[PDB]
């Protein structure tokens, strides 16, 4: 109920769902790139 | 782009400003000189009037004689050839007496005596100019801050030319007259005393010279930024704090956590500039008399890697 | 420890969260660079030596 | 935590990036987006200087030195213990300086004043980048930049200067030195004059700008004015830094010998080169 | 005295450097206390004195005897805004911006702020008014540069808002301070010379849009301007930079607002 | 602010519009950072090209500082 | 198709929305192509990892075809 | 992680997104530069 | 009772609970990473 | 190039945009692979 | 100890908490760097010598 | 009742109690860390 | 000694407490650094030599 930004709870929930979807997509792309690099040249 | 107030975009010219008459003897003040449009684009266009007092006359005569003595020595070194004089103008030098003569005034005229004559003229000229600054402040009822800042500059100058040669017991330690010659004196002074960079007082002098450049950049930039509020009229801001002084103070408070006042910034300015020559004179006075090699001194004081 | 929530009665969450994000990223970068500087735990050099990459 | 007049100036707006996300103050400091960036870069640089002190093996602050990569490494990266730390600290320093300038831009916009202060700071940033980035890149090695030590960057200055004989003979160096000396002289004069006007002889009334102009006209026959003196101070400092950056950017890139050898061109002009006598004859 | 040490490596050079460190600490203390003569004691965002006042204490008060019988000024001393501040707290916590309650340019808050100074003209050394219109200044005339008198005045919205009628000059400094601009309604406003760009054909005022020229505070006397009026005019014009931004027709601003 | 005439892009569901707006904000920030980084890289490249044109390799200065 | 509750993204001017939609179409095509390419690269990497696990280097076949 | 969405009621969404894009690009550049620093993984060191 | 941020006790408790949830998630990921590094290369 | 816009009255915009994104990515991959083919410009050949 | 709470009558909790956080972080970093400087207690180098990583 | 900061006596007491709880938790963690280090590698 | 409390009638308690905190921390750091500087009383070196860690 703090509302420093004027967003309601439902708006915050929807925006966070969109943001987390994007975050997981970006993380999956990064994981794919890391798998490619690790196969090409592992660092462990 | 917007107007940055670096150059005036229009000039207005009125009657020549004859100046205040607090206690100044108006007889000794000259007439107003020409108005310079070129100077008006940047500051005031008015030239003069200048005050020609007793100390002013003494200083002008002594400085003219010093300059003329150096010039006649340069003409002698040129073989009286104007082409040679122009070719080697920066390479001519009026060197002090050789070390064999110590502090004695028995050095021959072409081997150090003329340097002593020119140095006497410069000494009288500079000290009479200091008295002139003091008395010009006194005649207007102003404080003697200019006199004391000039005294700091004179302290460095006296250490270079008079005090340190006396403490070292030789006029050869003093600075030759000439452009490249005194540059070479600076370089050789650093080399002889072992990398003057490791003089802590030379380091402080450089710190305050850099601080002077930094502080004048900051202050000029601040006043030009707040000049849209009449911030250039600083005495008014001291007497009646306007929005210009407040905006300058708040800019610097929000930038670096602390600020000055419209008057206190000028205390910062005068002290930052004074400490340059103060620490410089102390550092030059210590060189040779107390420390003969500054790199070894820095090694013994944890400023250099070895030892 | 049950009253630690009162830290938010003193500090506004916006400035605290900004400061905490800066501090945490700074700390993580510092530790990673400390590890990279040492010959041990420099995982890139460890892998280079393991797979004979550096001549 | 606020000055007696600060309250009416703390208003939203003026930010370049972030809107109201970082539009707040921490004590007296205005943070902003670039303030967050500046603090991060500054803390990282300071902690890395401390860590480089750890690696070097000395805790004496005057002996702490972060040397750039050796000339063998060229312009590429280097191991952290032997030049990479210097590169990271240089990146952090450049980021901190640029973020500081942009934070000053934000503060200027908030206060409605001109951008003279960040613009003047940009000159110092450009001189720093000349010494650490532009000149080493032109010469092709990070080892031509100076170490981050209190007394070792003085060693860098000394060695770089004596590489070209007496560095006094660099003409752009001469111009920069004359600008620096003139700036110090003008700063002393300006501070002294304003203080003398504002603190006259005891019991006398405060003076006016007319008194200042009268004093300097009676002294040297000319008065530049309050606006004039502040313009002059800004221009002298900026010109000094510009000409020092120029002198270092031409040294080792388009000039390689002793600088007195440069000054020989005036001596060897056709109409007086062969005339005997003088110094160079 | 080369190599003469009182103890350890401490010699005359070490004595000098440590004594200078002491002197520098004392000088920094003195300079900061001198800087603490305005804006102190510190206040909270509501107005009450703050718990924190800083490591440096307030200096003992000093008195300036103002020229021309304008009284005295003792600093540090009790100073207040002496004007209502139309700002509202945007957060209970300190360190956050205060939003204007109404029109900030009219309210005189933010970049449009002004200070309640003396409502008297600024005087020169002789006691006469420092800033006077060039028509009332004896012998003053434009000496160089483009004469702005007669040129149209264009606002930040690229619309003409009046014409320059007169130049207000500082008699001692002999430099232009204010341009007097006649608007469409026949009344005249003042514009600081530092906020106007005198071009070949027009005078461009990037700070204010045309419609805001009427809102510039007016001078109660056609021949003199007081410090308070100067502060109000300058504050209004400068605050126009941040508060007339929507009306400003900058192309870069338009492109940035396209993507923002 | 003026209405677009194309009107074909309006057929997207509003949640995809929200996702596009979030991606656009992130891409705007990243693009400004990338512009700064590539401008710095181009400045370095310009100075490197100038250094290549100049005869630095023919006569280059020794190491100003002890290697470390 | 259901209306978004956020409503803050709606403040963008419609021409920027059109630009975002065009960029989104191009990015969707490029992302599908990139997914195909990275899936192929991951298949190749999986087979390379399996080949590394197997003792191919210990005993590997000669060249089936004349080199060319 | 159920109530992390409330962080968008503390920080403005679009501002955080712009700042986060800047941060992600700068972090990517930093990691690439650190990789270029090491002799291994220095993919721009194509040599004879 | 004490007021410096405008948050009530309930709002402060909710904010602190969410913050502690984030802190414990971050600490769990850090502990997993530390276990992985210690197994890969112990430092004690 | 004044009347090139009429190509959008021949080909559907969104379909062309999707196909063009595919084409641009595939072209970029093709050029990168050709560069990796040559011994010079083979940036993935980090060697001792 | 009984009346030490009155320190908060003198010192603002926000100022003191910020100062204490900065002080504690700087002190902890200082002590860790002191330990890392000494060849003993440099736990990274100790582990490297214990498991013979440097070879 | 000096009240430089405006806190009342009850507010100061509650704040100090919570602060000392935090300080004692921090001190206990530090003591455990020191015991671990002293066991692992004593400095006396 | 009885009237020493009157020092608080003269000295602002908050400024005195800040100055005293800074002074005590700096003094303690100075003494610890002096001890660490001397080859003896550098407790880290003493512990290294006692348990023969430096080898
Ligand atoms: C070797 C040294 C060689 C020296 C060569 C000469 C150099 C001269 C330099 C002078 C610069 C003057 C600049 C100036 O204008 O002053 C403005 C200013 C003028 O005040 P004002 O309010 O405007 O006067 C109003 C009058 O109505 C109107 O004022 P006024 O017109 O009458 O004049 C202003 C006043 C100003 O003059 C001064 O105040 C001089 C102050 C001392 C300057 C000398 C410093 C030497 C430093 C050496 C350090 C050791 C190195 C070894 O002049 C004087 O009163 C006499 C000055 C004569 C100078 C003689 C120098 C010898 O000077 C001051 O009065 C304040 C100065 C404050 C200095 C504080 C230093 C602190 C001392 C140590 C404290 C220890 C604390 C320990 C803490 C440690 C914690 C770790
Ligand atoms: C190889 C050269 C040596 C070296 C050797 C020296 C020596 C030697 C000296 C300095 C000095 C100084 N050096 Mg050093 N210096 C070196 C490297 C540096 C570097 C650098 C980046 O490398 C810097 C920034 C500096 C900076 C400085 C200044 C801080 C300082 C001079 C202050 C000043 O204004 O003097 C110039 C100002 C004056 C001399 C005062 C003049 C006042 C009088 C009254 C003027 C009379 C004018 C006359 C009448 C003419 C009137 C003309 C008419 C009006 C027309 N040095 C190296 C290590 N340096 C000086 C100093 O103090 O050192 C501690 C000094 O003596
Ligand atoms: C705080 C230290 C700085 C400083 C201060 C300073 N110098 C000063 C003053 C002050 C405060 C004066 O009041 C005084 C002055 O009148 O300035 C306008 C002066 C002055 N500083 C001067 C020069 C000068 N200052 C220098 C340096 C500096 N001065 C320091 C950086 C330098 C150098 C080398 O850096 C020079 C060349 C003069 C303009 C003037 C002193 C004039 C003088 O003594 O004149 C007598 C000599 C002649 C009249 C010869 C004339 C020869 C021909 C007729 C021409
Ligand atoms: C261009 C004219 C002069 C100038 C101007 C100038 N400088 C300025 C300004 C202006 C107008 C400001 O607005 C700004 C300011 O706020 O000043 C108070 C600034 C400033 N001028 C500064 C200093 C400074 N200026 C200098 C020079 C000059 N500044 C020019 C001569 C010098 C020197 C050596 O000549 C110094 C030391 C700062 C006070 C400030 C910029 C503050 C800043 O950027 O803070 C962030 C950075 C840090 C806190 C540093 C630590 C973090 C870094 C990441 C590490 C850097 C390590 C460094 C590389 C090590 C160097 C060690 C040395 C011994 C080698
Ligand atoms: C305005 C301030 C401008 C500072 C720039 C000027 C620097 C001059 C310093 C002179 C120091 C000196 O002379 O040393 C000998 C003098 C006296 O000799 P000393 O022997 O008694 O002290 C040196 C101590 N040992 C030997 C252990 C190294 O030392 C001092 O006066 C103390 C100076 C300490 C400076 C510490 C700087 C720390 C800054 C952070 C470092 C980040 C990297
Ligand atoms: C390791 C590096 C440590 C950095 C921090 C040191 C803090 C030392 C203890 C400060 C303290 O007790 O007061 C806290 C105070 C908090 O009190 P405050 O900010 O509320 O002060 C109120 C203002 N008075 C009381 C003067 C009216 O923090 C500071 O002021 C810290 C000052 C640090 C000075 C750094 C060295 C300068 C020489
Ligand atoms: C003579 C010229 C000497 C130049 C060398 C000294 C320059 C540094 C000045 C430091 C300073 O003023 O500290 C005050 C400020 C104190 O800032 P503050 O945060 O405590 O606020 C101002 C203090 N009161 C309110 C008491 C006025 O120091 C700093 O903010 C940090 C400076 C780091 C250097
Ligand atoms: C020196 O230290 C080194 C560099 C060596 C090591 C570094 C260490 C450190 C400290 C690293 C720091 C790491 C951190 C803190 C990383 C943080 C990463 C985070 C939180 C990233 C978040 C990313 C979020 C994104 C990109 C969200 C994007 C959202 C959208 C684009 C909107 C949604 C849109 C979608 C899903 C498009 C969907 C389209 C299709 C076709 C399905
Ligand atoms: C040189 O020395 C070295 C570096 C070697 C050794 C290092 C030493 C030091 C000094 C180490 C320092 C350690 C410290 C002090 C670490 C501190 C760690 C902490 C305190 C971490 C905290 C993490 C917390 C996190 C990640 C919390 C995240 C929270 C969220 C993601 C959710 C936020 C959202 C909220 C609260 C919504 C609330 C809103 C409403 C409306 C209720
Ligand atoms: C060079 O010298 C070396 C480094 C070798 C040796 C070092 C020497 C020295 C000088 C060491 C210095 C040691 C000192 C002075 C250490 C001091 C440590 C202290 C005092 C630490 C204090 C820690 C306190 C903490 C972590 C408290 C945390 C509190 C909380 C998390 C709760 C806060 C919430 C509150 C108060 C709620 C407010 C209440 C209401 C009702 C609103
Ligand atoms: C062509 O047109 C003519 C010839 C008419 C005029 C031309 C003049 C020319 C070409 C002038 C050239 C002047 C130059 C190049 C001057 C250079 C001056 C420089 C660079 C000076 C640098 C440093 C000087 C210092 C530090 C001087 C210090 C002197 C003192 C502290 C005074 C010492 C006082 C002494 C020894 C008094 C001894 C005497 C008695 C009776 C006790
Ligand atoms: Fe000024």
Author numbering:
A (entry chain 8), I (entry chain 0), L (entry chain B): 6 to 49
B (entry chain M): 1 to 307
C (entry chain 9), K (entry chain A), M (entry chain D): 1 to 55
D (entry chain L): 1 to 281
E (entry chain H): 1 to 260
F (entry chain X), G (entry chain x): 2 to 69
H (entry chain 7), J (entry chain 6): 1 to 48
What does the paper say about this structure?
The reaction center (RC) and light-harvesting complex 1 (LH1) form a RC–LH1 core supercomplex that is vital for the primary reactions of photosynthesis in purple phototrophic bacteria. The RC–LH1 supercomplex comprises an RC surrounded by the LH1 ring that is made of multiple αβ-heterodimers. LH1 collects photons directly from sunlight or from the peripheral antenna, light-harvesting complex 2 (LH2), and transfers excitation energy to the RC. In contrast, some Rhodobacter species, such as Rba. sphaeroides, possess dimeric RC–LH1 core structures, representing the largest photosynthetic complex in anoxygenic phototrophs.
Cryo-EM single-particle analysis determined two distinct classes of RC–LH1 dimers (Class-1 and Class-2) at 2.74 Å and 2.90 Å resolution, respectively. The Class-1 dimer comprises 66 polypeptides and 148 cofactors, with a molecular mass of 558.4 kDa; the long and short dimensions are 206.7 Å and 117.0 Å, respectively. The LH1 subunits, composed of 28 αβ-polypeptide pairs, 56 BChls a and 50 SPOs, form an S-shaped structure made up of two C-shaped LH1 rings, with two openings of ~30 Å in distance, encircling the two RCs. In addition, two PufX polypeptides are located at the dimerization interface in the center of the RC–LH1 complex, and two PufY polypeptides are located near the two LH1 openings. The two monomers exhibit a tilted angle of 152° measured at the periplasmic face of the complex. BChls in the Class-1 dimer form a continuous S-shaped array, ensuring that solar energy absorbed by the LH1 BChls in one monomer can be transferred to the LH1 of the neighboring monomer. The N-terminal region of PufX (Ala2-Pro15) is well resolved in the Class-1 dimeric structure, revealing that residues Ile6-Asp9 interact with LH1-1αβ of the other monomer via hydrogen bonds and salt bridges. In the Class-1 dimer, three UQ-10 molecules were identified in each monomer. Coarse-grained molecular dynamics (CGMD) simulations indicate that QY could move toward Q3, while the Q3 molecule shifts toward the QB site, reminiscent of the diving of quinones in membranes. QY was not identified in the cryo-EM structure of Class-1 dimer, likely due to its high dynamics and transient binding with PufY in the photosynthetically active RC–LH1 dimer. Extensive interactions formed at the monomer–monomer interface eventually create the stable and photosynthetically active Class-1 RC–LH1–PufX–PufY dimer.
